[PDB]
């Protein structure tokens, strides 16, 4: 197989997902949704940045949702101006579990990614291992399903320095 084997996520992405969930006061059954950035050219997918998306859905209507297309393009083009090495590789949401509309939402991201879109679920409530679950959409024996990829949390030097510093006094 030439399939992606695993995913690494930067601490900043975890913190960014949390701060997104918190600052929009996401509560109850709702989730927040955003875009992830990094490098998916190899069998190890490296997730190193992200940004929040406006996103509305009602769970009383599990197939109705609005994905802001212009927001993605406009925000991504500002991200390119800061760092062209971090590419749009997929999306994230707060879950904490896969939802019924995810495969459909994932399809729309195919339009923005060069790679097969990575879905990252970040459990911002952190209940019970790692607060992340990573998926790519695949065909199986024939229709579409999510393939679960193993995740680790990995930091580049600057982040390593920042995290250690933040996690002093503890």
């Amino acid at each position: 197989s030439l399939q992606h084997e695993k995913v690494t996520i930067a601490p900043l992405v975890l913190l960014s997902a949390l701060d997104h969930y918190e600052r929009t006061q996401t509560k109850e059954n709702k989730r927040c949704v955003g875009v992830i950035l990094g490098d998916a050219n190899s069998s190890t997918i490296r997730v190193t940045n992200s940004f929040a998306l406006p996103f509305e859905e009602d769970e009383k209507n599990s197939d109705v949702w609005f994905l802001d297309h212009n927001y993605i393009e406009n925000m991504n083009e500002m991200c390119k101006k800061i760092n062209a090495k971090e590419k749009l590789i997929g999306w994230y949401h707060s879950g904490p579990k896969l939802r019924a509309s995810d495969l459909k939402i994932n399809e729309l991201f195919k339009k923005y990614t060069q790679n097969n879109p990575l879905l990252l679920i970040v459990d911002v409530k952190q209940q019970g291992g790692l607060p992340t679950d990573a998926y790519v959409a695949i065909e199986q024996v024939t229709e579409k399903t999510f393939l679960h990829l193993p995740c680790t949390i990995e930091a580049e030097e600057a982040e390593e320095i920042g995290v250690e510093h933040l996690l002093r006094d503890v």
Partner: protein, 166 residues
């Protein structure tokens, strides 16, 4: 008295951005709130693009800024610009003559503006090289204390990095 509180994403973003720009200086804006007279809360920051003419008022692209501010607003982040950060890669944290002029411009927009300077090269594990400044009230500048604000959820999220250590 006086203290700048820098949040988790803010610190990590400043370090990440500073390190990525090496060997060049980088710059961006700090978001948060002026809590009282002696307290500034930086909850987030965003990077400004590199401009040819270095880190000065001219590198504050107000179109990019207005666009970013608007998009942040749509996703739950409507905090005031409480100052600016830039990197001094290898040469320590202080304000040059040009930095003082830039800070003065931010001061005219909002007298409480803070200038944060970080050194991404001398920042190493166990030692973050960073400082916060305001100008003396009527051109010298002084340092403010920097502390880090961090929720219980953030702490727990940070603990995942090297889990077998906790």
């Amino acid at each position: 008295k006086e203290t700048v509180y820098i949040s988790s994403i803010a610190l990590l973003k400043m370090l990440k951005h500073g390190r990525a720009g090496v060997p060049m200086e980088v710059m961006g804006l700090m978001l948060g709130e002026f809590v009282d007279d002696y307290t500034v809360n930086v909850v987030d920051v965003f990077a400004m693009p590199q401009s040819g003419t270095g880190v000065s008022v001219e590198a504050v692209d107000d179109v990019f800024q207005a666009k970013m501010m608007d998009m942040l607003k749509q996703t739950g982040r409507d905090q005031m610009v409480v100052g600016w950060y830039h990197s001094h890669p290898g040469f320590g944290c202080w304000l040059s003559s040009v930095d003082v002029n830039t800070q003065k411009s931010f001061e005219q927009l909002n007298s409480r503006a803070v200038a944060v300077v970080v050194d991404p090269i001398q920042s190493v594990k166990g030692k973050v090289v960073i400082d916060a400044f305001r100008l003396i009230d009527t051109r010298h500048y002084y340092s403010l204390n920097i502390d880090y604000h961090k929720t219980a959820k953030e702490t727990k999220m940070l603990m995942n990095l090297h889990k077998e250590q906790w």
